[PDB]
Design an enzyme around this catalytic site. Structure first.
Site, PDB file in Angstrom:
ATOM      1  N   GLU A  35      -9.922  39.395   8.459  1.00  0.00           N
ATOM      2  CA  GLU A  35     -10.849  39.985   9.443  1.00  0.00           C
ATOM      3  C   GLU A  35     -10.176  41.058  10.288  1.00  0.00           C
ATOM      4  O   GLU A  35     -10.782  42.086  10.564  1.00  0.00           O
ATOM      5  CB  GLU A  35     -11.441  38.916  10.379  1.00  0.00           C
ATOM      6  CG  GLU A  35     -12.336  37.909   9.687  1.00  0.00           C
ATOM      7  CD  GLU A  35     -13.714  38.464   9.296  1.00  0.00           C
ATOM      8  OE1 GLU A  35     -14.054  39.635   9.628  1.00  0.00           O
ATOM      9  OE2 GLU A  35     -14.442  37.684   8.653  1.00  0.00           O
ATOM     10  N   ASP A  52     -17.748  44.178  16.263  1.00  0.00           N
ATOM     11  CA  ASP A  52     -16.983  42.988  15.970  1.00  0.00           C
ATOM     12  C   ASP A  52     -15.636  43.098  16.700  1.00  0.00           C
ATOM     13  O   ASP A  52     -14.947  44.109  16.604  1.00  0.00           O
ATOM     14  CB  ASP A  52     -16.799  42.852  14.460  1.00  0.00           C
ATOM     15  CG  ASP A  52     -18.115  42.765  13.709  1.00  0.00           C
ATOM     16  OD1 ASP A  52     -18.957  41.886  13.990  1.00  0.00           O
ATOM     17  OD2 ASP A  52     -18.298  43.570  12.796  1.00  0.00           O
ATOM     18  N   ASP A 101     -22.501  26.199  14.718  1.00  0.00           N
ATOM     19  CA  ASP A 101     -23.875  26.683  14.851  1.00  0.00           C
ATOM     20  C   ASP A 101     -24.747  26.531  13.595  1.00  0.00           C
ATOM     21  O   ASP A 101     -25.852  27.072  13.564  1.00  0.00           O
ATOM     22  CB  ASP A 101     -23.875  28.161  15.304  1.00  0.00           C
ATOM     23  CG  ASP A 101     -25.170  28.564  15.999  1.00  0.00           C
ATOM     24  OD1 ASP A 101     -25.594  29.720  15.838  1.00  0.00           O
ATOM     25  OD2 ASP A 101     -25.787  27.714  16.689  1.00  0.00           O
TER      26      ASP A 101
END
Ligand SMILES: CC(=O)N[C@@H]1[C@@H](O)[C@H](O[C@@H]2O[C@H](CO)[C@@H](O[C@@H]3O[C@H](CO)[C@@H](O)[C@H](O)[C@H]3NC(C)=O)[C@H](O)[C@H]2NC(C)=O)[C@@H](CO)O[C@H]1O
Length: 129
Positions: A35, A52, A101
């Site tokens: 990432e 991001d 989540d």
């Protein structure tokens, strides 16, 4: 800051991510390499307008406030810049709410495409843990 591989492993375990919601430390270390390349100051703009932020690339459409993602949520209740620090508490804190989540680590696109189903144990190889 750019973390070393074992350095980041050590600090993620410190902060409770090894086996958090079933995911081994290797997964998280692998997620961060792909990432951000272990860079806490990493930022990336998305087409929808969102950005991001950080070592785990948390998106401002859903998780943090950057004051320029209009009509978005701030579910981790922090300003996005909070995620760019040399201290990874904030990012790891918010990461725990992301992975709980509903979709697991599938929320992290690079993990789904480059870590998922691979020998993720090899990212903590040689680390004094
Ligand atoms: C690390 C990161 O920032 N990843 C981003 C992803 O979070 C995001 O995927 C979308 O995430 C939202 C928020 O979790 C998902 O909404 C949830 O969906 C589940 C069912 O899948 C539902 O049960 C939850 O109630 C709902 N959350 C809330 C708060 O209501 C959404 O489904 C995900 N969408 C997709 C297409 O994967 C993506 C896309 O915004 O961005 C990443 O950067």
């Amino acid at each position: 800051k750019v973390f070393g591989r074992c350095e980041l492993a050590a600090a993620m375990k410190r902060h409770g991510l090894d086996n958090y919601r079933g995911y081994s430390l290797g997964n998280w270390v692998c997620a961060a390499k792909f990432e951000s390349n272990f860079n806490t100051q990493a930022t990336n703009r998305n087409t929808d307008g969102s950005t991001d932020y950080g070592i785990l690339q948390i998106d401002s459409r859903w998780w943090c406030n950057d004051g320029r993602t209009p009509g978005s949520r701030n579910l981790c209740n922090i300003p996005c810049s909070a995620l760019l620090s040399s201290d990874i508490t904030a990012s790891v804190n918010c990461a725990k709410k992301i992975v709980s989540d509903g979709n697991g680590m599938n929320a992290w696109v690079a993990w789904r495409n480059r870590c998922k189903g691979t020998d993720v144990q090899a990212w903590i190889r040689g680390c004094r843990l």
